[PDB]
Amino acid sequence: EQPEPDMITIFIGTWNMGNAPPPKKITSWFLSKGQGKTRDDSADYIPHDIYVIGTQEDPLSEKEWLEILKHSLQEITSVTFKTVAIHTLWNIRIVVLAKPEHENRISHICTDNVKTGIANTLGNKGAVGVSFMFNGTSLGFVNSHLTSGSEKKLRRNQNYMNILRFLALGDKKLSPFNITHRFTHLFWFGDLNYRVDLPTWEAETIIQKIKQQQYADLLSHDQLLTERREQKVFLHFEEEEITFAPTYRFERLTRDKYAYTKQKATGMKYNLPSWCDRVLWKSYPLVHVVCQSYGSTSDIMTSDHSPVFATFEAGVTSQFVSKNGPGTVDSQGQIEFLRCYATLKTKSQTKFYLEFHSSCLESFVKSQEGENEEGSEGELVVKFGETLPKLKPIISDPEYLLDQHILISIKSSDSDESYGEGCIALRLEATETQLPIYTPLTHHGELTGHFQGEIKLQTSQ
Ligand SMILES: CC(C)[C@H](N)C(=O)N1CCOCC1
């Protein structure tokens, strides 16, 4: 037998195809060749472990697109990839392909979609997603096509919050947790449709800057970067530095021209050159994740968007079995919390309790109610002191336990509704030692408070 991997590489692609069939060759996309952070030529024959393809305005049948994708990867790698999942909402599609050696490592495949907007605004924008387990590691993938238009960044932020609330991926037992907490690694990509927010009269200046590869002054006005910096969207997500030209809006059949001027076909809106097409991620604390490419193709010109690629190294763990767990506790293992308190932004006064969720526990654990005090600056402080239960992991082996994570929800005793969710890594500097812990708490992806204190982890070593 193959040894189980402790690392895999994942290819993420996002392309708004502009309702046009692709050209006969799209291999440059899967090879991370073009502009930006590109992949070394020496890696060209080396397959990624998993390929996740997100399309928007995709005119192809699932069958048509699968044939082009599989044939493309076969030509690059000489490997016949297995289809893990395919899911389409209108013209928004996600395909997950993996090397055949991974077929038995992949389980718990989930697909879902969310339609964004109401009446007028419901009919073609939203998201599709896929999750699964790769051995002991949970992976989520979201392909979203958000509201278009330079003057709708707020709508895009709203679309993002509706997708992260309502996309039903991952372990349904994680009931207090949205997709931004359910996965070891979460990749969120698509035509996010955020624009370079400069005056219309500066169109030709923007084009000039693009021809000089001087992106700095454009990225300082990129609505996704500015909204993220003001914590309006994609809180606690990462994005690699952008070093490729804006991927929208091109004249078709060339990349020599940006088509930005207002037309009946655009609803009389300008489309200033923009980084519409993006890849972000969020991984659990102290898990290996390294972006190894982030760029756009130069040679695929059927759409008014260029394809975007990103590749990642992602840490993965094995499906651990001991003499004891799974199927029982390992009395040599324990997780203890000392001097713990939650700080909440809520103006309400109910009692709160904690829930601890982790795949290292047989099931989730509910604490006693904490003691509410007033913070010096208005805040609600919920004190747990030394009252939190002792968590009993299924496996005590430090090779397993130090790789695990504890999700925390703080819940109202009156309503059992979560006011905040966060995550604590057990990748500690020491065992049998009081060490500080910390997580921000979010609800619907917005900051709602903090959890901090100390942890004491006992393993079999
Ligand atoms: C399975 C579905 C998501 C299907 N592929 C689809 O896109 N639609 C049917 C339901 O309503 C929206 C349109």
Coordinates of C-alpha atoms and ligand atoms in Angstrom, one line a residue:
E1 CA 0.0 0.0 0.0
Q2 CA 0.6 3.8 -0.6
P3 CA 1.4 5.7 2.5
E4 CA -1.4 8.3 3.3
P5 CA -0.5 11.8 2.3
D6 CA 0.2 14.6 4.8
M7 CA 0.0 17.2 2.0
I8 CA -2.0 17.6 -1.3
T9 CA -2.2 20.2 -4.0
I10 CA -5.5 21.7 -5.0
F11 CA -6.2 23.6 -8.2
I12 CA -8.9 26.3 -8.0
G13 CA -10.2 27.7 -11.3
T14 CA -12.8 30.5 -11.8
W15 CA -14.0 31.5 -15.3
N16 CA -17.0 33.6 -16.4
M17 CA -17.4 32.1 -19.9
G18 CA -19.7 34.9 -21.1
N19 CA -22.3 32.4 -22.4
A20 CA -19.8 31.3 -25.2
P21 CA -18.2 27.9 -25.8
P22 CA -14.5 27.6 -24.8
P23 CA -11.7 27.4 -27.5
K24 CA -10.3 24.0 -28.4
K25 CA -7.3 24.4 -26.0
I26 CA -7.7 25.6 -22.3
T27 CA -4.6 23.7 -20.9
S28 CA -2.9 27.1 -19.9
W29 CA -5.6 27.5 -17.2
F30 CA -4.9 24.1 -15.5
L31 CA -1.1 24.7 -15.9
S32 CA -1.3 28.2 -14.1
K33 CA 0.4 29.9 -17.1
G34 CA -0.2 33.5 -18.1
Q35 CA 0.0 36.6 -15.8
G36 CA 0.6 36.9 -12.1
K37 CA 2.0 34.3 -9.8
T38 CA 2.5 31.4 -12.3
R39 CA 3.5 27.8 -11.9
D40 CA 7.1 26.6 -12.8
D41 CA 7.4 24.8 -16.2
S42 CA 9.2 22.0 -14.4
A43 CA 5.8 21.1 -12.7
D44 CA 3.8 20.9 -15.9
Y45 CA 3.4 17.0 -16.0
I46 CA 2.8 16.8 -12.2
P47 CA -1.0 16.4 -11.6
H48 CA -2.7 18.3 -8.7
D49 CA -4.4 15.9 -6.4
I50 CA -7.8 17.7 -6.7
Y51 CA -9.0 20.2 -9.4
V52 CA -12.1 22.4 -8.5
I53 CA -13.5 24.3 -11.6
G54 CA -16.0 27.1 -11.0
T55 CA -17.7 28.6 -14.0
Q56 CA -20.3 31.5 -14.4
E57 CA -22.4 32.3 -17.5
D58 CA -21.5 28.6 -18.5
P59 CA -23.4 27.7 -21.7
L60 CA -22.4 24.1 -21.7
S61 CA -24.2 21.0 -20.5
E62 CA -22.6 19.2 -17.5
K63 CA -21.7 16.4 -20.0
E64 CA -20.1 18.8 -22.5
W65 CA -18.0 20.6 -19.8
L66 CA -16.9 17.3 -18.1
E67 CA -15.6 15.9 -21.5
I68 CA -13.5 19.1 -22.1
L69 CA -12.2 19.2 -18.6
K70 CA -11.2 15.4 -18.4
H71 CA -9.7 15.4 -21.9
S72 CA -7.7 18.6 -21.0
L73 CA -6.3 17.1 -17.8
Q74 CA -5.6 13.8 -19.6
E75 CA -3.6 15.7 -22.3
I76 CA -1.6 17.6 -19.6
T77 CA -0.9 14.8 -17.1
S78 CA -1.8 11.5 -18.9
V79 CA -4.1 10.8 -15.9
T80 CA -7.8 10.0 -16.2
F81 CA -9.4 12.0 -13.4
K82 CA -12.4 10.7 -11.5
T83 CA -15.5 13.0 -11.1
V84 CA -16.1 13.6 -7.3
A85 CA -19.0 16.0 -7.8
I86 CA -20.7 18.4 -10.3
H87 CA -23.4 20.9 -9.4
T88 CA -25.1 23.6 -11.5
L89 CA -27.5 26.4 -10.6
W90 CA -28.6 28.1 -13.8
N91 CA -25.3 29.0 -15.5
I92 CA -23.2 28.7 -12.3
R93 CA -21.3 25.4 -12.1
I94 CA -18.8 23.6 -9.9
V95 CA -16.8 20.5 -10.9
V96 CA -14.5 18.6 -8.6
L97 CA -12.1 16.1 -10.2
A98 CA -9.5 14.0 -8.3
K99 CA -6.6 11.6 -9.1
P100 CA -8.0 8.0 -9.2
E101 CA -5.7 7.0 -6.2
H102 CA -7.9 9.4 -4.1
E103 CA -11.2 7.7 -4.9
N104 CA -11.3 5.7 -1.6
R105 CA -9.9 8.6 0.5
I106 CA -12.9 10.8 -0.5
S107 CA -16.3 10.4 1.4
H108 CA -19.3 12.5 2.7
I109 CA -19.6 14.3 -0.7
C110 CA -22.2 17.2 -0.3
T111 CA -23.5 19.7 -3.0
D112 CA -25.7 22.6 -2.5
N113 CA -26.7 26.0 -4.0
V114 CA -28.0 29.3 -2.8
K115 CA -30.1 31.7 -5.0
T116 CA -29.4 35.4 -4.0
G117 CA -31.9 38.3 -4.3
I118 CA -35.7 38.8 -4.1
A119 CA -38.2 39.0 -7.1
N120 CA -36.3 41.5 -9.4
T121 CA -32.9 40.3 -8.0
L122 CA -33.7 36.5 -7.9
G123 CA -33.2 34.7 -11.3
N124 CA -29.5 34.2 -12.1
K125 CA -27.0 35.1 -9.3
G126 CA -26.0 32.9 -6.4
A127 CA -23.6 30.1 -5.5
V128 CA -22.9 26.4 -5.8
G129 CA -20.7 24.4 -3.5
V130 CA -19.2 21.0 -2.8
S131 CA -17.8 19.5 0.4
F132 CA -16.2 16.2 1.3
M133 CA -13.8 14.4 3.6
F134 CA -10.2 13.7 2.3
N135 CA -9.1 11.1 4.9
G136 CA -9.3 13.1 8.2
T137 CA -9.5 16.6 6.6
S138 CA -12.8 18.4 5.7
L139 CA -12.7 20.4 2.4
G140 CA -15.3 23.0 1.2
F141 CA -15.5 24.8 -2.1
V142 CA -17.8 27.7 -3.0
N143 CA -18.2 29.1 -6.6
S144 CA -20.3 32.3 -6.4
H145 CA -21.5 34.7 -9.1
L146 CA -22.4 37.9 -7.1
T147 CA -24.4 41.0 -8.1
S148 CA -22.7 43.0 -11.0
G149 CA -22.3 46.7 -11.3
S150 CA -19.7 49.2 -9.8
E151 CA -22.4 50.8 -7.6
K152 CA -23.6 47.5 -5.9
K153 CA -20.8 46.5 -3.6
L154 CA -23.3 46.5 -0.6
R155 CA -25.5 44.0 -2.6
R156 CA -22.4 41.8 -3.2
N157 CA -21.7 41.9 0.6
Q158 CA -25.4 40.9 1.2
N159 CA -25.1 38.1 -1.4
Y160 CA -21.9 36.8 0.5
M161 CA -23.8 36.8 3.9
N162 CA -26.8 34.9 2.3
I163 CA -24.5 32.3 0.7
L164 CA -22.5 31.7 4.0
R165 CA -25.7 31.4 6.0
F166 CA -27.7 29.2 3.7
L167 CA -25.2 26.9 1.8
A168 CA -25.8 23.6 3.6
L169 CA -22.4 21.8 3.2
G170 CA -20.3 19.8 5.6
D171 CA -21.4 18.0 8.8
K172 CA -25.0 18.8 9.6
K173 CA -24.3 17.9 13.3
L174 CA -22.2 21.1 13.4
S175 CA -25.6 22.9 13.7
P176 CA -24.4 26.2 15.3
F177 CA -21.7 26.6 12.6
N178 CA -22.0 28.1 9.1
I179 CA -19.6 27.0 6.2
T180 CA -17.0 29.5 7.5
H181 CA -16.4 27.1 10.4
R182 CA -17.2 23.6 9.1
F183 CA -14.0 22.9 7.1
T184 CA -10.3 22.4 7.7
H185 CA -9.9 24.3 4.4
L186 CA -12.6 26.4 2.7
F187 CA -12.0 27.9 -0.8
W188 CA -14.4 30.6 -2.0
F189 CA -14.0 31.8 -5.6
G190 CA -16.0 33.0 -8.5
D191 CA -17.1 36.1 -10.3
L192 CA -17.4 38.1 -7.1
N193 CA -18.0 41.2 -9.3
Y194 CA -16.1 43.8 -7.1
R195 CA -14.9 46.7 -9.2
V196 CA -12.0 49.2 -9.3
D197 CA -13.9 52.2 -7.9
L198 CA -12.4 55.2 -9.8
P199 CA -14.1 57.9 -11.8
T200 CA -15.5 56.9 -15.3
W201 CA -13.4 59.8 -16.8
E202 CA -10.2 57.9 -15.7
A203 CA -11.0 54.8 -18.0
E204 CA -8.1 55.6 -20.4
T205 CA -5.7 56.3 -17.4
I206 CA -6.6 52.9 -15.9
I207 CA -5.9 51.2 -19.2
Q208 CA -2.5 53.0 -19.4
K209 CA -1.6 51.8 -15.8
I210 CA -2.6 48.2 -16.9
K211 CA -0.3 48.4 -20.0
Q212 CA 2.6 49.5 -17.6
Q213 CA 1.8 46.6 -15.2
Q214 CA 1.4 49.3 -12.5
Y215 CA -1.5 47.7 -10.5
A216 CA -0.8 49.4 -7.1
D217 CA -3.0 52.5 -7.6
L218 CA -5.8 50.3 -9.1
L219 CA -5.7 47.7 -6.2
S220 CA -6.0 50.6 -3.6
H221 CA -9.5 51.2 -5.1
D222 CA -10.5 47.5 -5.6
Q223 CA -13.8 47.2 -3.8
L224 CA -13.1 43.6 -2.5
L225 CA -9.8 44.7 -0.8
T226 CA -11.4 47.9 0.6
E227 CA -14.5 46.2 1.9
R228 CA -12.4 43.4 3.4
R229 CA -10.2 46.0 5.1
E230 CA -13.3 47.7 6.7
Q231 CA -14.5 44.2 7.8
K232 CA -17.7 44.4 5.6
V233 CA -17.2 41.1 3.8
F234 CA -15.0 37.9 3.8
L235 CA -13.9 38.5 7.4
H236 CA -11.0 36.0 8.3
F237 CA -10.5 35.0 4.7
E238 CA -7.1 35.2 2.9
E239 CA -6.3 36.2 -0.7
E240 CA -2.9 36.0 -2.4
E241 CA -1.4 39.3 -3.7
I242 CA -2.8 40.2 -7.1
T243 CA 0.0 40.6 -9.7
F244 CA -2.1 40.0 -12.9
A245 CA -4.0 42.5 -15.0
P246 CA -7.7 43.0 -14.4
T247 CA -9.7 40.0 -15.8
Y248 CA -12.8 42.0 -16.9
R249 CA -14.0 43.5 -19.3
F250 CA -12.2 42.4 -22.5
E251 CA -13.2 42.6 -26.1
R252 CA -13.7 38.9 -27.2
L253 CA -11.1 37.1 -29.4
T254 CA -8.2 39.4 -28.3
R255 CA -6.8 40.4 -24.9
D256 CA -5.4 43.7 -26.4
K257 CA -8.6 45.8 -25.5
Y258 CA -10.7 46.5 -22.5
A259 CA -14.4 47.2 -23.4
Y260 CA -15.4 49.6 -20.7
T261 CA -17.8 52.2 -22.3
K262 CA -21.6 52.1 -21.5
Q263 CA -23.7 50.3 -24.1
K264 CA -27.4 49.3 -24.3
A265 CA -26.1 45.7 -23.6
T266 CA -24.6 46.9 -20.3
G267 CA -27.7 48.6 -19.1
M268 CA -25.8 51.9 -19.9
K269 CA -23.2 51.0 -17.2
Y270 CA -19.4 51.5 -17.5
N271 CA -17.4 48.4 -16.9
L272 CA -14.0 50.0 -15.8
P273 CA -11.3 47.2 -15.8
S274 CA -11.7 45.2 -12.6
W275 CA -10.6 42.2 -10.7
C276 CA -14.0 40.5 -10.8
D277 CA -12.7 37.0 -10.7
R278 CA -11.1 35.9 -7.4
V279 CA -10.0 33.1 -5.2
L280 CA -10.0 33.4 -1.4
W281 CA -9.6 30.8 1.4
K282 CA -10.0 30.2 5.1
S283 CA -8.3 27.3 6.9
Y284 CA -8.4 26.3 10.6
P285 CA -5.7 27.9 12.7
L286 CA -2.1 26.4 12.4
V287 CA -3.0 24.1 9.4
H288 CA -0.5 24.2 6.5
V289 CA -2.0 26.1 3.6
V290 CA 0.3 27.9 1.0
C291 CA -0.8 29.5 -2.2
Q292 CA 1.7 28.4 -5.0
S293 CA 0.0 30.3 -7.9
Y294 CA -2.6 33.0 -8.5
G295 CA -2.9 34.4 -11.9
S296 CA -4.9 34.8 -15.1
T297 CA -4.5 33.1 -18.6
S298 CA -3.5 35.3 -21.6
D299 CA -4.5 32.9 -24.4
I300 CA -8.2 32.0 -23.7
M301 CA -10.3 34.8 -25.3
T302 CA -13.8 33.4 -26.0
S303 CA -15.2 35.4 -23.0
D304 CA -15.1 39.0 -21.9
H305 CA -13.4 37.6 -18.7
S306 CA -10.1 35.8 -18.5
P307 CA -9.9 32.6 -16.5
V308 CA -8.2 32.8 -13.1
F309 CA -6.2 30.0 -11.5
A310 CA -4.9 29.5 -8.0
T311 CA -3.1 26.5 -6.6
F312 CA -2.5 25.5 -3.0
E313 CA -0.5 23.1 -0.8
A314 CA -3.0 22.0 1.9
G315 CA -2.2 20.0 5.0
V316 CA -4.2 16.8 5.4
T317 CA -4.4 14.1 8.1
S318 CA -5.0 10.3 8.0
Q319 CA -8.2 8.5 9.1
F320 CA -6.8 7.6 12.6
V321 CA -7.6 4.3 14.4
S322 CA -6.4 3.2 17.8
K323 CA -7.1 0.2 20.1
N324 CA -9.6 2.6 21.9
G325 CA -11.3 5.3 19.7
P326 CA -13.0 5.4 17.4
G327 CA -16.0 3.8 19.3
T328 CA -14.8 4.7 22.9
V329 CA -12.9 7.4 24.8
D330 CA -9.1 7.2 25.5
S331 CA -8.7 7.9 29.3
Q332 CA -5.1 9.0 28.6
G333 CA -6.4 12.1 26.8
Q334 CA -8.1 15.2 28.2
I335 CA -8.6 18.9 27.2
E336 CA -9.0 21.4 30.1
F337 CA -9.9 25.2 29.9
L338 CA -8.7 27.7 32.7
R339 CA -9.5 31.4 33.3
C340 CA -11.9 31.4 30.2
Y341 CA -14.2 34.3 29.3
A342 CA -16.2 35.4 26.2
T343 CA -16.5 39.1 25.4
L344 CA -19.7 39.8 23.4
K345 CA -20.8 42.9 21.5
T346 CA -24.6 42.0 22.2
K347 CA -26.6 44.7 24.0
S348 CA -28.9 41.9 25.3
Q349 CA -28.9 40.4 28.9
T350 CA -29.6 36.6 28.9
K351 CA -27.4 33.8 30.4
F352 CA -25.0 32.1 28.0
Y353 CA -23.4 28.6 27.9
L354 CA -20.7 27.2 25.6
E355 CA -20.9 24.2 23.1
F356 CA -17.7 22.4 22.2
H357 CA -17.8 20.5 18.8
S358 CA -14.9 18.4 17.4
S359 CA -14.4 15.1 15.5
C360 CA -12.0 14.2 18.4
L361 CA -15.1 14.0 20.7
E362 CA -17.8 11.3 20.6
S363 CA -20.4 14.1 20.5
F364 CA -20.6 17.8 21.3
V365 CA -20.3 19.1 24.9
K366 CA -22.5 21.7 26.6
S367 CA -21.0 23.8 29.5
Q368 CA -22.7 25.3 32.5
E369 CA -23.9 28.9 32.2
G370 CA -21.1 31.5 32.6
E371 CA -21.3 34.5 35.0
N372 CA -22.2 37.8 33.2
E373 CA -20.2 40.9 34.2
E374 CA -20.0 44.5 32.7
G375 CA -16.7 45.3 30.7
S376 CA -15.0 48.6 31.5
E377 CA -16.0 50.0 28.0
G378 CA -19.7 48.8 27.9
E379 CA -19.1 45.1 26.9
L380 CA -20.8 42.0 28.1
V381 CA -18.1 39.7 29.6
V382 CA -19.3 36.1 30.2
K383 CA -16.9 34.5 32.8
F384 CA -16.4 30.7 32.7
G385 CA -13.4 30.8 35.2
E386 CA -12.5 27.1 35.9
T387 CA -16.1 25.8 35.4
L388 CA -15.8 24.5 31.8
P389 CA -16.0 20.7 31.5
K390 CA -13.0 18.4 30.9
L391 CA -13.2 17.2 27.3
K392 CA -12.6 13.5 26.7
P393 CA -11.0 12.8 23.2
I394 CA -11.6 9.5 21.4
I395 CA -7.8 9.1 20.8
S396 CA -4.9 10.3 23.1
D397 CA -2.1 9.8 20.6
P398 CA -0.4 13.2 20.2
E399 CA 0.2 12.5 16.5
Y400 CA -3.7 12.6 16.2
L401 CA -4.7 15.0 19.0
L402 CA -2.3 17.9 18.3
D403 CA -3.8 18.1 14.7
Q404 CA -7.4 18.6 15.9
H405 CA -9.6 21.7 16.4
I406 CA -12.3 22.6 18.9
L407 CA -15.2 24.7 17.5
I408 CA -16.9 26.9 20.1
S409 CA -20.4 28.3 20.1
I410 CA -21.6 30.7 22.8
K411 CA -25.4 30.2 23.1
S412 CA -28.3 32.0 24.9
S413 CA -29.9 29.9 27.6
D414 CA -33.3 31.5 26.7
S415 CA -33.2 30.8 22.9
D416 CA -30.4 28.2 22.4
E417 CA -29.4 30.5 19.5
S418 CA -25.6 31.0 18.9
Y419 CA -24.4 34.6 19.4
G420 CA -20.8 33.6 18.3
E421 CA -18.7 30.9 16.7
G422 CA -15.0 30.4 16.7
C423 CA -12.3 27.7 16.5
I424 CA -9.3 26.7 18.7
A425 CA -6.3 24.7 17.4
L426 CA -4.8 22.0 19.6
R427 CA -1.4 22.4 17.8
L428 CA 0.1 23.6 21.1
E429 CA 3.7 24.6 21.9
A430 CA 3.5 22.1 24.9
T431 CA 1.3 19.5 26.5
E432 CA 0.4 19.3 30.3
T433 CA 1.1 23.1 30.3
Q434 CA -1.4 26.0 30.7
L435 CA -1.2 28.0 27.4
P436 CA -3.1 31.0 26.2
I437 CA -5.9 30.4 23.7
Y438 CA -7.9 32.9 21.6
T439 CA -10.5 33.0 18.9
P440 CA -12.6 35.8 17.5
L441 CA -16.3 35.0 17.6
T442 CA -18.6 35.6 14.5
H443 CA -22.3 35.1 13.8
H444 CA -23.4 35.1 10.1
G445 CA -19.7 35.8 9.4
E446 CA -19.8 39.2 11.3
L447 CA -17.6 39.8 14.4
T448 CA -19.8 39.4 17.6
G449 CA -17.1 39.0 20.2
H450 CA -14.0 37.1 21.4
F451 CA -13.2 34.0 23.4
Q452 CA -9.9 33.7 25.4
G453 CA -8.4 31.9 28.3
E454 CA -6.0 29.0 28.8
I455 CA -5.9 25.4 27.7
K456 CA -4.2 22.3 29.3
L457 CA -3.8 19.4 26.9
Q458 CA -2.9 15.9 28.1
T459 CA -1.9 13.3 25.4
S460 CA -0.6 9.7 25.8
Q461 CA 3.0 11.3 25.6
Ligands
LIG1 C1 -30.6 21.1 -9.3 C2 -30.9 22.6 -9.6 C3 -30.0 23.5 -8.8 C4 -30.9 22.8 -11.1 N1 -29.6 22.4 -11.7 C5 -31.2 24.3 -11.4 O1 -30.3 25.0 -11.8 N2 -32.5 24.8 -11.3 C6 -33.7 24.1 -10.9 C7 -34.3 24.8 -9.6 O2 -34.5 26.2 -9.7 C8 -33.4 26.9 -10.3 C9 -32.9 26.2 -11.6

